[PDB]
Ligand binder design. Structure first.
Ligand SMILES: *[C@@H]1O[C@H](CO)[C@@H](O[C@@H]2O[C@H](CO)[C@@H](O[C@@H]3O[C@H](CO)[C@@H](O)[C@H](O)[C@@H]3O)[C@H](O)[C@H]2NC(C)=O)[C@H](O)[C@H]1NC(C)=O
Ligand SMILES: N[C@@H]1[C@@H](O)[C@H](O)[C@@H](COS(=O)(=O)O)O[C@@H]1O
Ligand SMILES: N[C@@H]1[C@@H](O)[C@H](O)[C@@H](COS(=O)(=O)O)O[C@@H]1O
Ligand SMILES: N[C@@H]1[C@@H](O)[C@H](O)[C@@H](COS(=O)(=O)O)O[C@@H]1O
Ligand SMILES: *[C@@H]1O[C@H](CO)[C@@H](O)[C@H](O)[C@H]1NC(C)=O
Ligand SMILES: [Ca+2]
Ligand SMILES: [Ca+2]
Ligand SMILES: [Ca+2]
Ligand SMILES: [Ca+2]
Lengths: 217, 217, 217
C-alpha cells in the first residue's frame, strides 16, 4: 500500500490527477498523509504546506501546534514542521511562494531548493538560490535560521520576533517575510505584523492569498 | 473493515489527523459515514453536524430533508437526523455550539451531554447540563422536545413554530434558539426568524457562522 | 470495485449520499474519477464538469490542458475533455447550465441530451433539444462543431475565435455562448470575451457563477 502508493503530488500528476485538491501520499517512512496538491500553477505537481486565503484560522500559535500542523482542508493551514521536514529531508525539492493582493495582482517567488531540518535542529531552513519571481526575493535573508514561535524564541534578535511581528517563522533580526503573520486585509498601520513580503507589497500591506509549496527538482 | 477503524473524530485526532476536514468514521453499527471533523476548536476532535457560514444553503426544509441531511461538504450543511441519532445514541457525547458575529467576535456554549432519539421518538432532544460559554445557555429550554419542521408540527404552540420562525428545531412555544433559521446577516427588524441565540446576541441578530458539534465526554 | 461501484452522481444520490461535494465514480471503462456532485439542483444527482465562481483560475488554456482538465476542487475547474467524453458517451445525459449574475439573479438552460465525441473527432458537440430555461437557448447554435483552443483552431472563422474571444469552446463564426471566457465581473466594454450567454445577459456582461453539469435523462 505504501510501495504502490504515490510519494509526492508530482507522482499523482504523473498518474493522471490533473485537478488541485487533497490527496493521500506516503511519506518516506511509509506513513500516509493527506496533502493539498496544486496541479494548476507552473506545470503542477506541487505539494502545498502553507495556505492563507480569508483569515478564518489563527496563525499566532505555539511551538507544539506548529510542530504537528493546524487549520483546515476547507481553507487555511500549516501542514506541520515534522511533516515539512519529512517531505523535504532527502533529495531536492524546489520551493514556490504564490501571493495575491486585494486587487487581484498575482506575484510569485521561486527558489532552487528548500529543506527544513528536524526538531533537534529547530527546523533550520536550508534554502537554495533565488531563481526568479515578480514578488522579488524576501526569503534568502532567512537562510540558516531556526524556526521560532511566540513561546520558543530561537531568533537572532535580542527581543522576541514572533511576538513583535505576531507570527511564526524562520526569524533572524527579524524579517523581510512574515507569511504566517496576522490576516490584516491590505494596508495596515501596525508595523510588519501582517502577511508581508517586503520586496512585494512591503511592511504595511497584508496579502489576500499566500501559498508555499514544494516539488522534486 | 470497522473493527479497528475510527469511530469518532476524536479517534482520528488521537491517530495524528491534525487538520480539520472530511473523514470517514464507522458508526456504532459499522456503517461508514463521511463527516466533518473540527480538529482545532477547544482541544479538537469534534464531529460537526451543522454548519452555517454564508447563507448559500436553504435551511427552510421539510421533514424528509432534515431526516436525510442536506447541503454541501464545501459549505453549509445539516448532517441529517438519522445520522445525528446514530452518532449520539451510545456513550455520552458532549455538545459545543460555536457562533461568530459579523465583526468576527466568537461566542460559544457547551453542554455535558447531547443526544437525539430516533425517528419514532421524533428525534427528541436529550440535553445534559450547561457547562459554560460566553454565548450563555439557550438550549436547556428545549430539553425533552420533539423536532419539528414546516410540514411536521410536534411543537407546543397552537400554530406552527417552524413556519412562524422559518426554521426547523426542537420548538416548544416557540424558541430561545433558532440556528437553522434564515441567514439574515446581522441586525434584523423581523422577530426571531434568523440564526438567533437569545442569551447571546438576542432575537434580532443573525450570526455569520454557526456550528454545532459533538465529542465523547 | 467497479461493477458494484457508482457510475454517476445520480447513483450516489440513490444510494444515500445527500451532500454535494467531491466523490469517486467509475467511468464505463472502470477508471475511477473524483467528481463534483450537485445533490440539490432540480432534485439533485448532477455531475458538474465546469465551474466558475470568482476568477481565481485562468481558463485561457491550450488544447493539452483542456484535454486533461485543470483548476481546483476547492474552486473553479474544467473536468477535462477526455473525461467529459467518457461521461457522456453511453447512456444519455441531459445537460444543465446554471448561471448567476452579480445581483444574484439565477438563470438556467436545460437540454435533453448532451455528448462530446472523442479527441480524434475534436470533442465535437452533439446536443439534443432545448427543454426549458430562463437563460434562453445559447448552445444549439454550437451543435455539431469541433472544440477549439487558442493553439488549435477548428472553428469556421478566417481568424482565431479562441484568441479573439479569449476562451475555449465549440466556436463557429464565432459564438453566442463563451462560458470559458474571461472573468470580467459584470458589465464590460470589451466585446464578447467574458463569461457570456447571449440570450441571457448578452455579449457585454460576464456572469458571477457558471456551472455546466450532467445527469441521466
Ligand atoms: C549557519 O549559521 C551558523 C552560525 O549560527 C554558522 O556557523 C559559523 O560558521 C562560521 C563559518 O562560516 C564559523 O567560522 C569559523 O570559526 C573558526 C574559529 O572559531 C575559524 O577557524 C574560521 O576562520 C571561521 O571564522 C563560525 O565559527 C560558526 N559559528 C558557530 C557558532 O558554529 C554556519 O556556518 C552557517 N551555516 C551556513 C551553511 O552558512
Ligand atoms: N427529494 C426532495 C423531497 O424529498 C423533498 O420532500 C422536496 C422539498 O424539500 S424542501 O426541504 O425543500 O421542502 O425536495 C426534494 O426534491
Ligand atoms: N504542462 C502544461 C503544458 O503541457 C501546457 O501545454 C503549457 C501551456 O498551457 S496553457 O493552458 O497555459 O496555455 O503549460 C502547462 O504547464
Ligand atoms: N436538433 C435536435 C435533434 O438533433 C434531435 O434529434 C431532437 C430530439 O432530441 S432530444 O434529445 O431532445 O430528444 O432535438 C432537436 O430537434
Ligand atoms: C419528557 O417528557 C414527557 C412529556 O412530554 C414525560 O412524560 C417524560 O417523563 C419526560 N421525561 C423527563 C426526564 O422529563
Ligand atoms: Ca530573540
Ligand atoms: Ca405533514
Ligand atoms: Ca403546533
Ligand atoms: Ca479559424
Amino acid at each position: 500500500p505504501c510501495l504502490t502508493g504515490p510519494r509526492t503530488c508530482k507522482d499523482l500528476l504523473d498518474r493522471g490527477h490533473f485537478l488541485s485538491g487533497w490527496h493521500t501520499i506516503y511519506l518516506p517512512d511509509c506513513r500516509p498523509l493527506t496533502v493539498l496538491c496544486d496541479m494548476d500553477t507552473d506545470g503542477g505537481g506541487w505539494t502545498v504546506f502553507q495556505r492563507r486565503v480569508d483569515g478564518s484560522v489563527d496563525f499566532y500559535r505555539d511551538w507544539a501546534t506548529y510542530k504537528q500542523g493546524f487549520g483546515s482542508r476547507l481553507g487555511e493551514f500549516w501542514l506541520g514542521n515534522d511533516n515539512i521536514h519529512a517531505l523535504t529531508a532527502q533529495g531536492t525539492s524546489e520551493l514556490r511562494v504564490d501571493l495575491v493582493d486585494f486587487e487581484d495582482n498575482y506575484q510569485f517567488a521561486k527558489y532552487r531548493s528548500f529543506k527544513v531540518a528536524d526538531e533537534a535542529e529547530k527546523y533550520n531552513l536550508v534554502l537554495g538560490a533565488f531563481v526568479e519571481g515578480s514578488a522579488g526575493d524576501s526569503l534568502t535573508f532567512h537562510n540558516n535560521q531556526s524556526f521560532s514561535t511566540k513561546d520558543q524564541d530561537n531568533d537572532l534578535n535580542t527581543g522576541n520576533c514572533a511576538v513583535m511581528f505576531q507570527g511564526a517563522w524562520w526569524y533572524k533580526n527579524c524579517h523581510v517575510s512574515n507569511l504566517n503573520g496576522r490576516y490584516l486585509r491590505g494596508t495596515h498601520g501596525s508595523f510588519a505584523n501582517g502577511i508581508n513580503w517586503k520586496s512585494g507589497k512591503g511592511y504595511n500591506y497584508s496579502y489576500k492569498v499566500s501559498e508555499m509549496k514544494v516539488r522534486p527538482a
